[PDB]
Symmetry: D2
Amino acid sequence: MRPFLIGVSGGTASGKSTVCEKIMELLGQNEVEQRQRKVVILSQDRFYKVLTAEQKAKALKGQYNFDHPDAFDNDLMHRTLKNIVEGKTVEVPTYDFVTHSRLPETTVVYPADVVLFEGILVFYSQEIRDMFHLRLFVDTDSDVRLSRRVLRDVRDLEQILTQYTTFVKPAFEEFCLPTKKYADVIIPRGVDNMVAINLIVQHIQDILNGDI
Amino acid sequence: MRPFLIGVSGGTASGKSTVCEKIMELLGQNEVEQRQRKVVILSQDRFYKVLTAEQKAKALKGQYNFDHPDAFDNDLMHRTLKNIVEGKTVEVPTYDFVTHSRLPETTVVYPADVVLFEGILVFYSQEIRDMFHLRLFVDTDSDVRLSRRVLRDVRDLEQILTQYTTFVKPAFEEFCLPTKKYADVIIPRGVDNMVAINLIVQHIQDILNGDI
Amino acid sequence: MRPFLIGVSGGTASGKSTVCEKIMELLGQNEVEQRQRKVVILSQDRFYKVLTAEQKAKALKGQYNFDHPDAFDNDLMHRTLKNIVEGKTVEVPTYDFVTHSRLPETTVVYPADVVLFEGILVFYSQEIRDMFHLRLFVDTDSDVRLSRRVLRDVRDLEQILTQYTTFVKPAFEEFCLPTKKYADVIIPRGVDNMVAINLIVQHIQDILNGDI
Amino acid sequence: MRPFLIGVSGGTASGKSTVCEKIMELLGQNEVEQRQRKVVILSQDRFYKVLTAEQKAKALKGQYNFDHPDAFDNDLMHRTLKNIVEGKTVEVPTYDFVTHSRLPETTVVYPADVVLFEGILVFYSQEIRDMFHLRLFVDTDSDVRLSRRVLRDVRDLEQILTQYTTFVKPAFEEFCLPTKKYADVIIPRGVDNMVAINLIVQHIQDILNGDI
């Protein structure tokens, strides 16, 4: 099928996104302007909702759940994917993590042969789930993920930790972890796993070469 | 590298062996006489030791641990593999599960392009472990495995259960499960996972076609 | 508070019920006619619903889920407990596992000082959950539970296994296991754990002696 | 038996130590000079070895494993306990976490009726293990523990995380977690679990009152 949709899920900082980046790099695709690419990465976090005045006020005081499925603009996500699958050019938002808002300009995604769709909840809903030709889950222990997440989020410590305890952990466990059962292939660790990456890279090259 | 060695581990009745059989079937290799095959399956259980008179007497009374690494003739296993890797013809034993002994005649394995080596402990020792180009682990919950194992072993129930409680479970947990960390790719469920099988089958076909 | 309600949960064959029986035995209460008892055991499985003609027909063909919360007459359970708590005499059904029906005669439970309420789902609903002064969870691995369950259920093997795979396992994981988080005290293994039993038995004796 | 030895284990920041402190507080024992106490807390971390010049140099550069059983002066620990059990006054070291050394002055522990012995590895060796009348394990998820540990250790972030990834996590999993199987009673969460604490506090009061 064209485009071939590969779903990649896992907890935040599992390596789901490092793996996709690594795949693009090894394919040489990251050295090519967006419009000329045959392989594309799509993150679920581009589809976070624009917050209302008061959801925003909850977010500053660390009391808004970004790991609940309702945190995502699912309708937009689904229609975007449904257009990618139909082989069309789509416009895609950019999300500002600091200003919990969606940026003025959109990103243009031209038809690809392969789409890497990554995110914490890309297997949650059956509509999206059934769109994948291959479903990957990057399985990394929570304590390891929290250390990467913590390191990445220092760029306040206490509120990072409080928010993870109250919201991220419970929601990962209720919504994200149960979706592991849909994975075709489980990739442990993340970008460390070069043999796993190469297996997927080789599969993608067969698709691009037309060896299937 | 030639032969390409794929290690497949997991608990007993995980699907590690159903997956290998499925791979051979889809490749068409199971419809070919042993000597003409390019892809071969090798089970670790061909390398169980011949029991002494009294280890045998323990086995009838269900008191012998077949899931401990010492249950395996490791020296023979290692030399056999070391010869397969060197591209040589090897002789391989057949083990009789009922008579806890090794059968009169050996099986001849001719040089293959791909070797699927499956077993509960094929990642336990570093010598063997480092020989694999690809390491797979078929991850299936213990309760599910025990039901398949139980069904397969009825062909006495109470002693099956007692032996699993005393010996199989503890040894799986101490020796086999910790080796999951060496897996490149984790395959959940078993033969149900057609997408996983096909991914590996495609990789093997690239090797046989010389697309790598 | 009088009666003191102790909830004991865990998977089927975890030991939740062996532990309660052991507690009664050590207290000497099992050598006393029902009406004279100060400590009583109440099983959730007395509260299974009477099946309709066609739910019954599903049950014979092994296609009815006895591990779903809807399998239980929750209203009856809740009112019964709400009366026990109010210090009243209650009538309680007996369930026939073979004929998937409720027996002609009820059992009379007279006011107790302590009630041991055991079952797979006694922490599922908040109404019941909040009634417990002490919440125990007997945590035993699924493979171990399945072996006891299998042994107990032979008194057909293949259908036991099929039903456990299709219905018991999924429902234990979705409904029962998540309720572990409500446990005050986790008791590993079951009746093997004499130190745990004795701790609870001593606590119960303090209540009966009026040392609290 | 007098003294009654209660072992409390769990990962670092599990709550094993908050629970003991809470027990002392509720008993009123923390408002009593050391020498007059009937209940005492003993931490395994008082028994860390004095480092050699070069183990110390490894520690500053974050390359020394404080979670390995060899990190502990086991001989001293064992003899100290063996004297406590024999109802004798013992001297006990104080460890300086910053200067990875043992402080000039020792602490005097007078005979107690109850000893709470807490630490990551107090169930590791059978000699010590068999000395406990009651074995508790405070079970708290690694990600939760790491957040408390991280917060407590800021008083450098990157090296805390690197050291936890390289040394703490692997050693917790290899040495500490497997000892959970020896626990009589598992206490989830930590100090949040007031019902669990009170159960143990009541048991201790029965011992002190001579109700057993």
